[PDB]
Amino acid sequence: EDYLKCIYEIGEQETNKMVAEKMHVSAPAVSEMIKKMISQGWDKAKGYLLKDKGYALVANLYRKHRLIEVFLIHQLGYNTQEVHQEAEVLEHTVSDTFIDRLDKILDFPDFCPHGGTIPRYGQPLVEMNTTTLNTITELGRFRLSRIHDHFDLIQYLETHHLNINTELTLTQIDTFAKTYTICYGDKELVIPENIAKQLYVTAL
Amino acid sequence: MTPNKEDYLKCIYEIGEQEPKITNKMVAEKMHVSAPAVSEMIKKMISQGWIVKDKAKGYLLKDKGYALVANLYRKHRLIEVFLIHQLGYNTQEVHQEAEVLEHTVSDTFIDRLDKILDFPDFCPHGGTIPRYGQPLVEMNTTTLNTITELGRFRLSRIHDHFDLIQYLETHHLNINTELTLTQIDTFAKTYTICYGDKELVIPENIAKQLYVTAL
Ligand SMILES: [Mn+2]
Ligand SMILES: [Mn+2]
Ligand SMILES: [Mn+2]
Ligand SMILES: [Mn+2]
Question: Does residue B125 have a known ligand-binding role?
Answer without folding.
Answer: yes
